[PDB]
Amino acid sequence: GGFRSVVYFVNWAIYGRGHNPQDLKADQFTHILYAFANIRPSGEVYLSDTWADTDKHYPGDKWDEPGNNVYGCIKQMYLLKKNNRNLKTLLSIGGWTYSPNFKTPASTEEGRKKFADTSLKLMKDLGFDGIDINWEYPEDEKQANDFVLLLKACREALDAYSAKHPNGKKFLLTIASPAGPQNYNKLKLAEMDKYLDFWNLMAYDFSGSWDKVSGHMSNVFPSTTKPESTPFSSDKAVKDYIKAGVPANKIVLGMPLYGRAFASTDGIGTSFNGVGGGSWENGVWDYKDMPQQGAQVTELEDIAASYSYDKNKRYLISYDTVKIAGKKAEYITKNGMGGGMWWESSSDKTGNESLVGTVVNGLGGTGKLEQRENELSYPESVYDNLKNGMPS
Helix, strand or coil: CCEEEEEEEEHHHHCCCCCCHHHCCHHHCCEEEEEEEEECCCCCEECCCHHHHHHCCCCCCCCCCCCCCCCHHHHHHHHHHHHCCCCEEEEEEECCCCHHHCHHHHHCHHHHHHHHHHHHHHHHHHCCCEEEEECCCCCCHHHHHHHHHHHHHHHHHHHHHHHHCCCCCCCEEEEEEECCHHHHCCCCHHHHHCCCCEEEEECCCCCCCCCCECCCCCCCCCCCCCHHHCCCCHHHHHHHHHHHCCCHHHEEEEEECEEEEEECCCCCCCECCCCCCECCCCCEEEHHHCCCCCCEEEEECCCCEEEEEECCCCEEEECCCHHHHHHHHHHHHHCCCCEEEEECCCCCCCHHHCHHHHHHHHCCCHHHECCCCCCCCCCCCCCHHHHCCCCC
């Protein structure tokens, strides 16, 4: 098959960001990752926002209606799948904020069994093609081990479901993985790979407020001239993954659609104190808001990194340009990697300025994206309108 184009639809984007699933350029992708479901100490996976997720009525939803029915972004994503049949959706569990509660269920057979089962129940009822775990980060040799076992459990679970439905599709298991050496070096990567469909390497937040010098937050290559401006790099991670035993074609290069800012700076690699404003939180900006008035944009193609810098206000926002998206796409193709992943669907521009448009086209356009038809048959769904494939 060819390249994967994967994006996060962050459940909360239907609030202040105003982004609903309907607003996805679905033809451009192959995998939506609906983030994020939470986990109980039991290992019981559950939906973080029943309003947005399942209860909200959009245009098109009878408020009245027979049957025990799903609405929310889950109904809307199933609608997206009916139309774009190469669009798969996976339910994402965990994420930075919920990751503190992985370790405890993950340690016990009971907890992991309950993870796998609740996860699958939720997948098969809510119409998802698979599940994506985002654990930041299995903090020790034991957690590492337990993460093989969790994935093994989850893989086994979805497989048993395929067994029960031979005329249907097989289901996906993915994880959002760490580009930082101090984190992936603890992982039992090769063992974990045996269970995984693909790995979405989170190749971003290499720099931010936690630093003392402004850096490139999602650069591909190390700056030999300016080591301090590149604390991390996509490429270190990717080659290490490969040497560990992960097939590169199973490694999806994660890419930001937001930029991280630095205040009172002389430019990349110098010190900053503070991070400034943001589009929604401090120090973080949506790409569709870039470039900011009065800043000149620098693009270091060599390492495939860019930023804008305002000379007067001494404000640096590390983010990618379509030229750098190009350079990234090129790294994907050149290295026989699995494709590109993005965080997150609301912040991209459209048209000829879409970073994801750039990467898909540099990937060879949609004709080169992986062709895998999604699952519309969910026979065991507890919801009737979803189980009947959503009529009017």
